[PDB]
Design a protein around this ligand. Structure first.
Ligand SMILES: C=C(C)[C@H]1CN[C@H](C(=O)O)[C@H]1CC(=O)O
Ligand SMILES: C=C(C)[C@H]1CN[C@H](C(=O)O)[C@H]1CC(=O)O
Ligand SMILES: [Cl-]
Lengths: 249, 248
């Protein structure tokens, strides 16, 4: 049978393919993660059906009820066989689902304007005039929520106190805020690179604040996890992942 | 108590400098030693460090398919963990398990400063400047296996000149760069260590590929996923970055 693959719209990883005529099935989608999935299927010999996660979320756990949502929740409940998306491999997620080895490596950094005196997270933390934030309940926000590093703890105190005003619901919302207010956006370096290639007034500020990878998610114990790892390593060694990144970035 | 196989390689694993001979685990320090200590704390195991007898990381014989090095120790259940700058590669992942990466890196080029050489392509299209890699390591194996024209050409060069351009260690490669017209294909994390210590040397071009180092375990080992979770904990609390800063 075909594997059910859960994913989510996020440029340039997953988007709706443009066509003058209606599109159906997997043909509706394109992007880096779609090429990846195609290449994985070519190596491993499975067929698949792409489905957008209904709740539009990656996967985080609620504090009170301990319930998961998003693509992670779909894998937990065995409603999908794989999740293929820019899904960060994190400690809390690894506790509840399995991940392939990374197909991309990245870190949190800062998206802001060029030509300013701001050069690091510490510069942001020490002031309040320039607002800053992150996608609510994502891996980036979770990093700040849990950090014991003085600088990042202060940034979390700032963001948490202004939740409604500085946390956003998507990368697109955060980017639009950098573009239309005095705002710096804490976001993943791979997506920053995409943005800065297309917006000459924007830049990454400072280096990477942490390090993580994106991996393909599976339900805990899935036999596909290790198979997908091996295929990913093959794709990397063949230069195919690099070609795919060049194509979409 | 777990048996941990490793290998000397600066600054991952070193013999501690000492007036008197040291014994057992006391003999060793380095990034990978700190990593092992941190893992042991999180997971609650004791361990004995043993240097791999054959001094190899792990490659497969092209005729008989047998493995050597730390990979062989794991396959043979002579060790529980391998903790070293052991690249997570397609061929190795097929026979042993690896944790998720504690360090990410890629192949690049170590050469002298001030030349017009700017990329692998520049090396491949000539022969006056010799180049090579550590024999049978993950770098050499990338070239051996690559279908990319430039890298296949470089493999043809290095292959045909095995005796003279392939080396036994990073140290031998670095000395070649310093004493002759030679460029050394080597891992970018080691290049970084080297170029911080020698201002006449530089990385040429960017990364040619991307890989990680991971802790190795025998296939099927229950420790693999526990070590992965520990590594993720160490990364998220900033410890892996501090460890790299400390040793580089
Ligand atoms: C696109 C966003 C919502 C996702 C993508 N990776 C992160 C994740 O896996 O949670 C989130 C971004 C972030 O937290 O900066
Ligand atoms: C120090 C060397 C021999 C090891 C380290 N990592 C690679 C490996 O895991 O094979 C080798 C280096 C290289 O191949 O450039
Ligand atoms: Cl894994």
């Amino acid at each position: 049978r075909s594997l059910i693959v859960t994913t989510i719209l996020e440029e340039p990883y997953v988007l709706f393919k443009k066509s003058d005529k209606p599109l159906y099935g997997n043909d509706r989608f394109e992007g880096y993660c779609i090429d990846l999935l195609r290449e994985l299927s070519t190596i491993l010999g499975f067929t698949y059906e792409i489905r957008l996660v209904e709740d539009g979320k990656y996967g985080a756990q609620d504090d009170v009820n301990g319930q998961w949502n998003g693509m992670v929740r779909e894998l937990i409940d065995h409603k999908a066989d794989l999740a293929v998306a820019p899904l960060a491999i994190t400690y809390v997620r690894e506790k509840v689902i399995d991940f392939s080895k990374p197909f991309m490596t990245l870190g949190i950094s800062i998206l802001y304007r060029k030509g300013t005196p701001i050069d690091s997270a510490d510069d942001l933390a020490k002031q309040t005039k320039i607002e800053y934030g992150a996608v609510e309940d994502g891996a980036t926000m979770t990093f700040f929520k849990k950090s014991k590093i003085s600088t990042y703890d202060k940034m979390w105190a700032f963001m948490s106190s202004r939740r409604q005003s500085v946390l956003v619901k998507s990368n697109e919302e955060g980017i639009q805020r950098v573009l239309t207010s005095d705002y710096a956006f804490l976001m993943e370096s791979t997506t920053i690179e995409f943005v800065t290639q297309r917006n000459c007034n924007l830049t990454q500020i400072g280096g990477l604040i942490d390090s993580k990878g994106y991996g393909v998610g599976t339900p805990k114990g899935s036999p596909y996890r290790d198979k997908i790892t091996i295929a990913i390593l093959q794709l990397q060694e063949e230069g195919k992942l690099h070609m795919m990144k060049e194509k979409w970035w």
